[PDB]
Amino acid sequence: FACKTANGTAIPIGGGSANVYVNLAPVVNVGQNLVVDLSTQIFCHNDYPETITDYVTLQRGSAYGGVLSNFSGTVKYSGSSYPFPTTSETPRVVYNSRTDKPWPVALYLTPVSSAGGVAIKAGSLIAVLILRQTNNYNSDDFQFVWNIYANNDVVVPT
Numbered sequence: 001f002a003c004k005t006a007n008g009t010a011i012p013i014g015g016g017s018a019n020v021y022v023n024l025a026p027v028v029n030v031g032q033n034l035v036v037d038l039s040t041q042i043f044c045h046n047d048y049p050e051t052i053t054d055y056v057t058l059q060r061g062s063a064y065g066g067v068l069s070n071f072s073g074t075v076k077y078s079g080s081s082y083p084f085p086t087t088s089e090t091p092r093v094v095y096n097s098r099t100d101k102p103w104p105v106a107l108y109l110t111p112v113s114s115a116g117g118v119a120i121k122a123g124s125l126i127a128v129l130i131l132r133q134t135n136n137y138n139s140d141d142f143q144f145v146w147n148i149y150a151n152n153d154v155v156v157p158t
């Protein structure tokens, strides 16, 4: 089991960590969502699907910088919705193919009432999402840690 990002980097067998940049709508009002869809960027696959079944959860989602201070959020993982930052590990998604399949995580962030001005800075760390991977074959229990960075400033109209 391993993961990579679209035109980007890879995390190899056994787990590890990688930095991911995201495009964000440059202006967002109170009552609107920033939708950060990671499923177009993070792709994983199973290395021996004929004999092994891989299990993948979102173990935790944390907020950082302007997201932590200026937004409230939910995370959508494989069709279900949860508070972001998260309160517990999600159920599992099955990976059973050598073919790249997306990691189905999306963040919906909405500006808090105190948010105003540049609420997220270009280049800043905004989130960490931890993918946890196990199987039906051995004791493997690995973490794939995704550091999420803002590509552009996001302004909350005052």
Ligand SMILES: CCCSCCCO[C@H]1O[C@H](CO)[C@@H](O)[C@H](O)[C@@H]1O
Pocket: 001, 002, 013, 014, 045, 046, 047, 048, 049, 051, 052, 053, 054, 134, 135, 137, 140
């Ligand atoms: C015919 C199979 C012989 S075992 C091959 C061991 C390879 O294990 C890697 O690949 C497995 C399947 O993706 C993972 O479950 C495991 O965690 C690790 O990433």
Ligand code: NI
Pocket: 002, 046, 047
């Ligand atoms: Ni592979």
